[model samples]
Target: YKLVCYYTSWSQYREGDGSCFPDALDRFLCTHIIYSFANISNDHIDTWEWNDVTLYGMLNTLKNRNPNLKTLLSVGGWNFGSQRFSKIASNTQSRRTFIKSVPPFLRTHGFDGLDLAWLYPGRRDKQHFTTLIKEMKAEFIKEAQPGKKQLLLSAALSAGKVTIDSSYDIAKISQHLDFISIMTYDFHGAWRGTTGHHSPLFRGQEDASPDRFSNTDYAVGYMLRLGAPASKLVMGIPTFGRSFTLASSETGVGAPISGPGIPGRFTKEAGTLAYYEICDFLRGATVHRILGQQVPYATKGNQWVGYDDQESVKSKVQYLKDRQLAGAMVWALDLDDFQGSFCGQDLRFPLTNAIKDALAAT
Candidate 1:
């Protein structure tokens, strides 16, 4: 099984205890490390952040210690905007040019693969997106050298059924790509009026009708139903939680929310709480665990958060193994409590360790 870990470039810029560097990563933990959000420039792949080049060098250096570790460069994210990917995939010459640049760029940067994380392609860009994957895989096969391993190709897929049906030709693309990572988290957040778990393992009582398809089990089953091979499916597990400020007396999963919860002192992002911050919040919080859902939520006054803990992550890992999926993919490594500053555990990265332990047990 592949323990695919996503390392966000912006994490290096986080303030105080939130800041993460390449050294913080445990090379043995993740089978694959995907550096997030490289850019597309002049119809060719390019570095986005100012220090991306240096960071890439530092990140890949881990391979020296753990020779089996694979590093992939992920292009496009929610912030990358769908229009750019749409433009690239829709044109022949430009798409070809971008495809041609992939192998050399990955080779040059010490990456073993590429992860196309186009936020999403519209209905019009759907077939073109399939074409892009087919062509890119063809190009990769053509470019492979005799002794070296062929570069891997994968995509980060939308978990929503509506998006899956409209934006991707799953059967066609799955045949060409090496694997597909479904972003099974982020089903609900502060963006909605009510408080809901962002990544529930199973459907909760609050979920009804249209919202019933918002859990991890539904998303994974949806991909399988659409012809994604169980062997090629990688399920996502988040290291952070979504939070909200209560607007009324209710304090459960579907409670009304006034707005995003107060931002963590280190993360500095509203409606979000890093595991470390959640650990601090748990000190005096009233934690509630849903038996059927297999995830937890905590309330401290008006602040309510739904997130995964060590036990919940183990359940998710067991679920992954039970489904015979490829492996678990952490949405990000930075948000995890990489230090022993929180969670009171003597060891660092309690959640990831839980994933690793559970994955190896079977």
Candidate 2:
């Protein structure tokens, strides 16, 4: 099984060189590392800053540390908006422009391939998206030199019913790419005004009708049923938790929420907490596993945190193996503990380490 992990570009701003981004990446454990995002302008890809050019080049040096490491540049994200891509994909000249721009730029910067991180396509985007993937795959195949490795192609896919049904023509689309990453997290968060598991393996009995499509099992199964091959599916596992402010100290999962949960001491955010912060919080709080959901979480007074620990991560890894899936992917590498500061003294990156070991095991 392959272990793919993401390294955020902006993480450098938060933790500096010692703890953030490419410099802090543990290259040995993962087989592939995808750089978070490279912004796009009009019909072509653009680095947000001139320094990103240097950062992109520097990122490939991780292969120096571990010979097997492969890196890909992810273009666009949720905030980048789908309109730009919809514009580019629908227009033939713009599609040609995009297809022409990819090869040399990736080759010059030492990137192995490209990952289209477009949030989701629209109902109107059906034929155009299929056209985009087919043309890009043809171009990538044509551009490679004799006997050299061909560049890879991939995209971050959505799991929501409306988006999945409207955004993709899976059978034809999956044929041109190496694998598709199902962004299986963020099914529910503070945005919902009610608590739910960020990424659960199964849908237990108490799960309401709205949550029927929320868990990893149903999402992946739905995609596969849409003519996507299970061999090409990669499941995303979050290294952090979805948090909420409980309306009462007696609240349970799916309970009403007043507002965001208290921010983390280290990775401060009103709505979420890093797994490390979750670990630190659990030390003084009462941690409980959701009755039939098979995941552990905590609700202490007004603070509610739903996150995965080593045990839950292991359960996910075992699930991936059992399903004969492609592998496990972390939303990011930095959210995981690397300093051993949050948990016990002897442990470092317990969540990431657990994923790596479990995927590699028979």
Candidate 3:
């Protein structure tokens, strides 16, 4: 089983307990840890942060702690946008220039592979994306040695059905990628001006017909129907939650929301709360577990937030196992209670630990 976890570069800048350094990571916690992300510059791959070189060395050092552990360097993110990726794949030379740098850069950084995190793609970009992966896969195979494994190539793909149809030639891409990480979270958030769970494993009672496709099960099912293999699919689990400000006293899944909720003390992002913040929020809040959805939401006065806890994570793990998927993928390691400061359990990475244990039981 592959337990893939993403470690964000910006988490190092967070203050106090929120700050995460590679040395503090439990290398055994994940089978694979992706260092996110590098950048596409001048049609060649480049480091994104000032201390990326330093961080890369520190993260890869964990390999010594666990000989089985694998590390990958990711490129592209929501903020990185699609422009650079599209530009790079526009023509043969541009694409060649970008592809040629992969093996060397990954090898130099001690990364075993590369992950492409193109947020969302259009129809034209979809065709180009398939071509890119195919060529990249060929390049990786061409550089393989007798005893050494070929460099791994994977993608962090969108979970929505429409996006799947519009952005991917599922069968084609699956053939080239070692595995696909399907981001099942971010299904709902403050942007919709309503309170809803960001990652529900099942369809909620409050959901409309259109929203029937917004849960984890539907996303995975759609991908399967489109010919993505179960063994090559990795379900994503979020280490953070989405919050919203209630419009009135009525608090439920479909309740109206005025705007994004208050920012977390550490992450400092409105409408978003790290897992630690959610743990702290749960201390005084009235939490209700949504019946059919199998996830929980909490209410405190006019503040409403939806998130997954250990119980929900356990359920999600069971779901992944039931579907015979490769394994689970955590969005970012730092967003969890890495320091074990707020949750009072004195246990670090509670949600991640829950996943690891669940996987082991099977």
Candidate 4:
């Protein structure tokens, strides 16, 4: 299984400068990379200028330095939430325009491929996404065939039923491109209004059913059931954890949390905090885990939040191998500190290297 890394708009590494890319790549085994949101208007995407020397220039530097690196442009993200997808997918002309523009854009910027990250197809838009893929595939094939180097095609898909049902017709979609990325994280969060696992392999509490949902198993199983080959499906694992404060002393199942805790606290301003954050927090602050290895809860002065840890990540990786997924993906590389001065003593390499060792054994 290949290790894929993502870089989002709000990344501190990007904000501070591009030094993080080269520095992080020096230590990690990132075979594939998704450059998050080039066109999406939401968040930093709209405001950030696409300087070839900065964005694509970095891609070229990486490619020149490491010939094996494959990078793709991730178009839409969760925050964008499918606002303009319907318009792009609705017409052949629009789709053609997008397809034609992408190759030149990538060539100019020095990217190896394109990763479509449309949050939803018909959820917010009235267009049919299946047709969009069909058109996109045709264009990609036409352009990719005569090219000197092969360009890869990929997508970042949601784990929700709405996206699963409408956006991806995997059988037909797979016929077009290289692989499809399943976003298996965010299965539970403060948004759910309960203390639960952010990315669990199984249900945590007694109320959790045998058939209960989990990002690791459920999303991958769903794709297999829908006819997506294991080799073509990449499983996503978050480098960070979601936090929420608890409201009461009930502790275990269904513990209420206070105002939503911070998301991605590992930035320079936010600093480095992740699953290890919660683990360290539990050691220093008030926190406990559920029996099923699904969730963790912490409390301090009536404030409580739930998150995941390296243990959960270890289990999730094992589950991915057991189910025979293509590989694992993390939200961003900046969250991990292999140097050990930040983010709980550099857990990313340990976790990712463990995955590589396991895959090598298989």
Candidate 5:
């Protein structure tokens, strides 16, 4: 089993000495390391006044320290705009340019492979994506020599049906790639206009809507049905949660929550907060769990946010093993407390250790 960790270029550690990345890496036996958003539209990737030498140096250092670690360059992210993918993938020249550029960039930076993080490949160009992957694979095969390191090709995919059906030609495309990462998290959030599980294994009571599905079973089963081998499927698990506001004082399972509500103190930060943040907030916040044991909620006053912890992570790990998945890939590593101490030593990173131990047990 392989454990993959992701890091972003603009993170605090990246700006500093990058000790945080190595710190977490030392704790866990990570086989694959992914650098997120090398070409995103965000300030991290875009609007860069400084030279990219610093970024390249950091990657080289990481590669040197962990010879066994395979580093991949991730392209798009959730916030970054993916409008250019369709255009680039549509034209053979553009696709060739991209495929050719990645190898030289990897060689120059001393990296291993590329991980396409195009947020929603289906949302923009459906047919073009297939061609894009094909071109990328062809380029990788040609560029990578027999004696040299073999370049890996992987993509982060959405668990939704629309994204799956549109972006991936599973039967045809699976053969070309090393592995497929299924993003099984973020099933429920404030965007849905209701409060629910962030990454649920099965629909909870709050999910009154009968059509809701288990993120785990649905995502895994869908890929299998689409002809993707289970060994090639990597399951995604989130360390953060989605939050919302409730109109009533009612709390606990099946509680009615009003929409457009902001995240609780635990998840006040918009993106994703690590388990450390979740642990710190537990001091002054109220914690609740749905009846299905698939999801957990933290509340302070009327604000609410659903997130995952050791318990949820353990369940997810068991689910992965039960289904005989390839492995697990976390969204990012910085979210967890590398020191194993937080909230004045009251909290520790149980999820990280849980995953490691789970892999060991299996």
Candidate 6:
């Protein structure tokens, strides 16, 4: 299976004392590494860090660890709304501006490709997305033909049915992108009134709502039915868990949820916990697996943690192989215990390593 791992720029701070820099990364763990984002503002590229040149140069250094490793720059994210791209893609001049900028920006930065992580495309501008991809492919291909690094292009797409239909043109998009990574998690969380798995392999039998919603299986099937070939889709697995506060003692799948659990010791986010924090919290917690869902959860008093452990990750990897899909991807590398100090000193990247092992086993 092809392994794609996201390396978030902000993780420099999130991993404790801002120590999680690119040099600390295990470069050999995955086939390609995607730098979280280099924003788009007023039809041009922007960087958050002042020393972005150094950052980009340092990121490309991972290629030394494994010459096969390909680094990509992801543009836009959930925080980067669709308006920037919506406007750019719809206007031929604006699209040409960004397209003209990619070759030099990527070549100078030593990047192999681009990954458009537009959280979504709005309902009105769905066609603009296809236009943007087409425009980019049309513009970038001029750089080809020589023995130079040919740039690849990909995107992080939505999994929800409403968003999928409203945000993408699957068959047309497939033609432009090298592959698309599906954000298949976040079915339920602090936002939901009841507990649910963050990334279930299959829909749970006890789920009352429409099964069309979450679950990696349903998302992949929907994408396939919508005309994206299996080999062109990559499944995303979280290196973290959705944390929730229980409303009562009955802390099952459909049980009422009060709110988000308290923030983690490291990742200071209440709605979610890094796998490192999760491993620390789940010890001796009541473990429960949703029947047929291939998802597992744990609850301790008022804290309910629904996460992907090694077993669930293995199941996800197997599902990708079973479906003839491209491969598996993780949301971010920092969320996993890269340092291995918190979860266990010896068990670094247990979840991601499981993915690597499963891919090799297959």
Please give the lDDT score for candidate 3: 0.89
Poorest lDDT segment (10 consecutive residues) of candidate 5: 40-49
Whole-model Cα lDDT per candidate?
Answer: 0.90, 0.80, 0.89, 0.62, 0.67, 0.83
Query: Arrange candidates by TM-score, highest first: which order?
Result: 3, 1, 6, 2, 5, 4
Which residue pairs come into collision in candidate 3? none
Superposed Cα deviation of residue 225, candidate 3 (Å): 0.8
TM accuracy, model 5: 0.86
lDDT of 6 by residue, 1-362 (tens): 67899988877766453257787778888898899889776687667666667778788998985899888999998887877888888888888888888877888789999899877889877888888888777656778657665689889998788889888889998998888899989877567688888788887684454465677888999999899988888999998889889899888887788898888887888878888888789777888887768878889989998888888898888888989999988887888877776665576677788889998893
Query: What RMSD does each model have against the real structure?
Result: 1.3, 1.9, 1.2, 4.0, 3.7, 1.6
What are the per-model numbers of colliding residue pairs?
Answer: 0, 0, 0, 9, 0, 0
- The candidate with the higher TM-score, 3 or 5, is 3
User: Which parts of model 6 are misplaced by more than 4 Å?
Assistant: 15-18, 206-210
TM-score of each: 0.97, 0.94, 0.98, 0.84, 0.86, 0.96
Arranged by lDDT, best first? 1, 3, 6, 2, 5, 4
- TM-score between candidate 1 and the true structure: 0.97
Candidate 6 worst ten-residue window by lDDT:
204-213
lDDT at residue 61 of model 4 (Cα atoms): 72
Question: Model 4, 1-362: lDDT tens per residue?
Answer: 77777765445344332224533553236788777768733221222444524755554577666788888778877776676766666656666677667666776667788888887776534236666666666666777687557677888778765568766677777776588888876766555566566666555454553335654566778888888888888778776655566677765545666546543334422212454444445555765666675545565554455544555566667777788778877775554443343445544454455545555654
Candidate 2 similarity to native, TM-score: 0.94
What tens-digit string does per-residue lDDT give for candidate 5 at 125-169? 776777778878888888865766678898888887767877778
**Which residue runs does candidate 3 get wrong by more than 4 Å?**
206-210
Residue runs of model 5 more than 4 Å from their true location after superposition:
13-28, 40-52, 63-65, 205-210, 258-268, 343-349
Q: Could you give me the TM-score of model 6 versus the true structure?
A: 0.96
